[PDB]
Design a binder for this molecule. Structure first.
Ligand SMILES: Nc1ncnc2c1ncn2[C@@H]1O[C@H](COP(=O)(O)OP(=O)(O)O)[C@@H](O)[C@H]1O
Ligand SMILES: CCOc1ccc([C@@H](C)N)cc1
Ligand SMILES: [Mg+2]
Ligand SMILES: [Mg+2]
Length: 265
């Protein structure tokens, strides 16, 4: 159906390990969108064809205001192209670089939006497993949208693919290669809440080997400026035992969330 010829390409929006993402406009309709380009040679070399298939299948069927739309795809014998919803206000990653730290209202609002989106995903037993600021994008009204479903699966699951970059957002059970489920995304939600308020994630360290140690032992501390309500929510999410982590409905009804979020469940 679609082909490269149908689009005018514009400026680079961002880069990923595999993805090279561009602004684009479809010629007949003038519809503005994002084109995510993947190189077939690099896909085959890393052996991640199944992840690409998952990304397309899972993301094209989900419909939620806080989840990024995937409209389709095409390919041309060197490249694969995913057709995505364009997020005009960029990444949460960039926004944190700009401001250093978020205040409590901003943080609580982002956490509410994330919990709404994940609750929807989990009701289909879809777990994302790669929630981190570079994969959280912003819509025209500044609302958060989860993207990059390449690592997503159906629970419960093992891990069959090599971990690539940072360990910072992953729970103990996933770094230790054990069996895991939906609770992995609750752990990541805790890591994000901390990084949003403090400016760096809680198990950050100079080497892979030391980061691993801090995560498996759940060794983190709070700066003085973090309030008691924030400490309570974050301490509840960062539990070594997955079954002790709260349900998303409990996060959405936490007193700190309800006192500070500008958006509802
Ligand atoms: N729909 C989009 N709108 C705006 N920017 C995007 C969009 N998709 C991706 N980006 C930018 O491109 C980067 C890589 O996209 P991503 O889908 O995460 O690739 P990878 O799978 O390689 O991580 C993102 O971190 C973001 O900076
Ligand atoms: C959803 C489509 O998935 C694909 C996966 C791999 C390839 C290439 C690498 N042979 C093309 C499509
Ligand atoms: Mg990504
Ligand atoms: Mg990916």
């Amino acid at each position: 159906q679609w082909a490269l010829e149908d689009f005018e390409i514009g400026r680079p929006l961002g880069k990923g390990k595999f993805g090279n993402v561009y602004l684009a406009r479809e010629k007949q309709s003038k519809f503005i969108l994002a084109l995510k380009v993947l190189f077939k040679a690099q896909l085959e070399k890393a052996g991640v064809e199944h992840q690409l298939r998952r990304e397309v299948e899972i993301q094209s069927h989900l419909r939620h205001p806080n989840i990024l739309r995937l409209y389709g795809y095409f390919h041309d014998a060197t490249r694969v192209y995913l057709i995505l919803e364009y997020a005009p206000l960029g990444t949460v990653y960039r926004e944190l670089q700009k401001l250093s730290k978020f205040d409590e209202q901003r943080t609580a609002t982002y956490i509410t939006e994330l919990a709404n989106a994940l609750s929807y995903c989990h009701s289909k037993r879809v777990i994302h497993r790669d929630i981190k600021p570079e994969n959280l994008l912003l819509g025209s009204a500044g609302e958060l949208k989860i993207a990059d479903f390449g690592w997503s699966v159906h629970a419960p699951s093992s891990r069959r693919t090599t971990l690539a970059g940072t360990l910072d957002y992953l729970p103990p059970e996933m770094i230790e290669g054990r069996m895991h489920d939906e609770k992995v995304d609750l752990w990541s939600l805790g890591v994000l809440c901390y990084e949003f308020l403090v400016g760096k994630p809680p198990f950050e360290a100079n080497t892979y080997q030391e980061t691993y140690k801090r995560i498996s032992r759940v060794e983190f501390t709070f700066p003085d400026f973090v309030t008691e309500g924030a400490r309570d929510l974050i301490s509840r999410l960062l539990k070594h035992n997955p079954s002790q982590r709260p349900m998303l409905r409990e996060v959405l009804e936490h007193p700190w969330i309800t006192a500070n979020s500008s958006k509802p469940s």
